């Protein structure tokens, strides 16, 4: 099948928004759920997997987080916030050098963004904490 049609896709877009509304509601698993429902509607959206892993990242489900974050990068090979998700996954897992590599890439794309810098430098300093 081609990309699912409008209503279906826009509803996946909806569940993106609804799950965002659940993240705003501080419920990451419903966010996880609605994002999964969005994966039922469309597939190749790093947005869905990225914030799903981000939700797992909130619920310290880093095993799933690392999977889904990496999965997003497979769906949208260039998604800056997607690398950021995978980076956080590695970072939280204790892979500071691995996370640094991803964070580094993010800060190499937008070094003007302290939102990217922050976690880069945070991982970087922690590498130095390790000597």
């Amino acid at each position: 099948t081609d990309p699912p049609a409008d209503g279906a896709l826009k509803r996946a877009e909806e569940l993106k928004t609804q799950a965002n509304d659940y993240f705003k509601a501080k419920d990451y698993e419903n966010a996880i759920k609605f994002y999964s429902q969005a994966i039922e509607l469309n597939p190749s959206n790093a947005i869905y997997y990225g914030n799903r892993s981000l939700a797992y990242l909130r619920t310290e489900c880093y095993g799933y987080a690392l999977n889904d974050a990496t999965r997003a990068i497979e769906l949208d090979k260039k998604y800056i916030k997607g690398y950021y998700r995978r980076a956080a996954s590695n970072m939280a897992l204790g892979k500071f050098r691995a996370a640094l590599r991803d964070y580094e890439t993010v800060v190499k794309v937008k070094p003007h963004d302290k939102d990217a810098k922050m976690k880069y430098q945070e991982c970087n300093k922690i590498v130095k904490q390790k000597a």
């Binding site: 993106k16 965002n20 705003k24 990225g50 914030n51």
Partner: peptide, 5 residues
């Protein structure tokens, strides 16, 4: 803000 995605 709201830009989770």
């Amino acid at each position: 803000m709201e830009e989770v995605d």
